[PDB]
Structure formats: C-alpha cells, structure tokens
Amino acid sequence: VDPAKEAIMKPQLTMLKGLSDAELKALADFILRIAKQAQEKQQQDVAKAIFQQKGCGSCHQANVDTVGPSLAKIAQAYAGKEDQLIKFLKGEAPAI
Amino acid sequence: VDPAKEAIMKPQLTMLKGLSDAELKALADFILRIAKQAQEKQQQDVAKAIFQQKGCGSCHQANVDTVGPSLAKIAQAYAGKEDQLIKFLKGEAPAI
Amino acid sequence: VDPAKEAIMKPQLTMLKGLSDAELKALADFILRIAKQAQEKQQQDVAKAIFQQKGCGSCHQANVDTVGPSLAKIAQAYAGKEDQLIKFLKGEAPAI
Numbered sequence A, B, C: 001v002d003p004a005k006e007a008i009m010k011p012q013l014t015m016l017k018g019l020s021d022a023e024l025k026a027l028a029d030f031i032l033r034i035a036k037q038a039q040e041k042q043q044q045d046v047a048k049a050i051f052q053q054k055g056c057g058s059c060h061q062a063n064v065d066t067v068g069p070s071l072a073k074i075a076q077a078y079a080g081k082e083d084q085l086i087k088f089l090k091g092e093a094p095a096i
C-alpha cells in the first residue's frame, strides 16, 4: 500500500465496528463480486437497447422462430464462435 | 444459409454501422446468452406462481423450518435426485 | 420420513394434479434452487446497505478509481483471499 493512501483508508475501518461476523462476510462477498456484476448489467443494458432500437427484435424472438430464427437457434449455431459472430455482425463473415 | 433468407437479413447489418467494438461485443454476448436466460425466467415465474397459489409456501419457507421443512432442507435431501423429486411431486415415489 | 409428518404432506400432493410434466419440472427446479438464491439476495442486500450507509461508496465506485481504488481493483487484489479481506475489514490485517 501507499502509506499516504492507507492514511485516508485506515480511519474508515472504524465505520465497520459493531457489525457481526455474518455482516462482515456478506460485505466481503459483495466487495469481491459487485464490480463484475455491475459491469455485466451495464453491458447487457447497452446490448438490449441496441437490439430493440435497431429493429432486430421485430424478426428475432428469444425462443420462437418468426421472420428469422430464434436467438436460441442463433446461439446454438454460434456456440464457441463469438469471434465469428462479431465478424458476422460487422458484415465481414457471411452467414453460416 | 438459405440464400433467400440471407437476402432478408444481410441488409439489416447496415443498422449496426457506427457502433463501437465494445457495443458489438456486448451485442454478441447478448445474442449468445439471452434465450436461455429468458427461458429460465419464464419457467421460474411459472414455478413460483404454482408454489404460492397451490398453498406450498404456507408450510415451506426458503430457509427456516415451520410446519414443514425449509426448501433448503428439501433441496439438500434431493441434491442430485431431481428425477426422484419429480416422481415424489407426482405421488409416484414416497417421501425419503 | 416421519410417518406423522408424511400424513400432513401426502394429501397436499393432490394440489399438483392436472399440471403438465413441464410445469412439474419447473416446480422441481424451483424447489432445488430457490433457497440458495433467496439467501444470497438477502445477504447481498445487507451488504449493499452497509456499503452505502457507512460511506464506502463515496470513495469506491464499482469500475472506476476515484478517491480510492475501484471495487474491481480491490476484488483483483483479494482474489482467492477472502479470509484476508475479512481480516482487513476488521482492522486485523494491514492493507496489501
């Protein structure tokens, strides 16, 4: 640690006094997990908005074929081929 | 691909022009994951409604024993035995 | 099973009559998964409230460094060291 930064943080540990072991365990779990969970939600919200706004959802339902194949069908075809999927989305790789 | 179906889809790739690599990565992640996530939510909503409406929740809380064992206790007993659990629910297998 | 407890439960299986195999599969999935999911939500709500109420969020954003390091940065440093993280939170282990 940078001692000057520790000097800012160390005093804030007093704010956790009186919490139970269970509370501190939950807090530690949260500290370890929240950043990835928040990032994934942010990215998925961005994706969902694009998918609806650009018109994709008009032909692609999650689990039923309509005008186009379901997203289940698409996901099956591109399982383990995300690089190729991105290339398809960019117009660089033809449809499978 | 069916060329006649490609003729419908290929033009829609123009709707993704101007999006960043990060946006396209999020979109691809979404395409790969959403169908399973949507199906699991749909199924879990169906299950939760049955569980409450049929009266199960009156005797079975998630993590505390009341009239009957907690769902944690039940899940422990049936861990790796979902086929047997379904048979129990149907009246075909006696309680453990 | 305790026969006296089976006598309470067995009759309630009549409440599942007329449900499809798919409905019963969803119900069994729910029975197997809900207790852990409910416990984890309860714990994470407790943690989130502590984190905000005690002032931690004023210096620790999820994915950007501000006054203090991001929670992503913290999680990286403490990956596989949750015991040490808890000890740090208690004032027992110095910062890394």
Ligand code: HEC
Binding pocket: A051, A054, A055, A056, A057, A058, A059, A060, A067, A068, A069, A074, A088, A089, A094, A095, A096, B001, B002, B005, B006, B008, B009, B010, B012, B013, B015, B016, B031
């Ligand atoms: C909005 C920009 C989108 C996105 C992200 C996708 N589509 Fe479509 N699509 C349609 C049809 C008839 C097909 C089958 C033909 C084919 O497979 O190319 C498709 C297919 C796809 C795929 C799979 C590509 C592959 O390798 O097979 C993907 C990833 C995909 N789409 C994404 C039909 C339509 C529409 C009907 C008018 C509209 C609108 C869209 N698609 C829009 C999008």
Ligand code: HEC
Binding pocket: B051, B054, B055, B056, B057, B058, B059, B060, B067, B068, B069, B074, B088, B089, B094, B095, B096, C001, C002, C005, C006, C008, C009, C010, C012, C013, C015, C016, C031
């Ligand atoms: C609503 C239809 C439900 C569902 C899906 C379940 N129950 Fe009960 N239950 C009760 C008691 C006292 C016991 C212990 C006796 C026993 O174990 O059989 C149970 C047990 C269960 C189990 C576990 C079965 C096993 O193998 O042990 C399962 C899967 C289960 N229940 C599901 C008591 C009650 C009630 C009190 C009046 C009511 C209502 C229900 N149960 C309803 C349901």
Ligand code: HEC
Binding pocket: A001, A002, A005, A006, A008, A009, A010, A012, A013, A015, A016, A031, C051, C054, C055, C056, C057, C058, C059, C060, C067, C068, C069, C074, C088, C089, C094, C095, C096
């Ligand atoms: C509210 C009680 C909290 C909790 C749970 C944490 N902090 Fe902070 N913190 C700050 C600075 C400048 C640093 C860097 C110095 C250092 O690393 O010690 C930190 C660091 C942490 C860590 C990492 C500990 C380590 O081993 O490096 C953890 C787990 C942590 N914090 C938790 C700055 C601040 C504040 C600015 C005034 C406030 C308020 C907090 N922190 C509050 C908390």
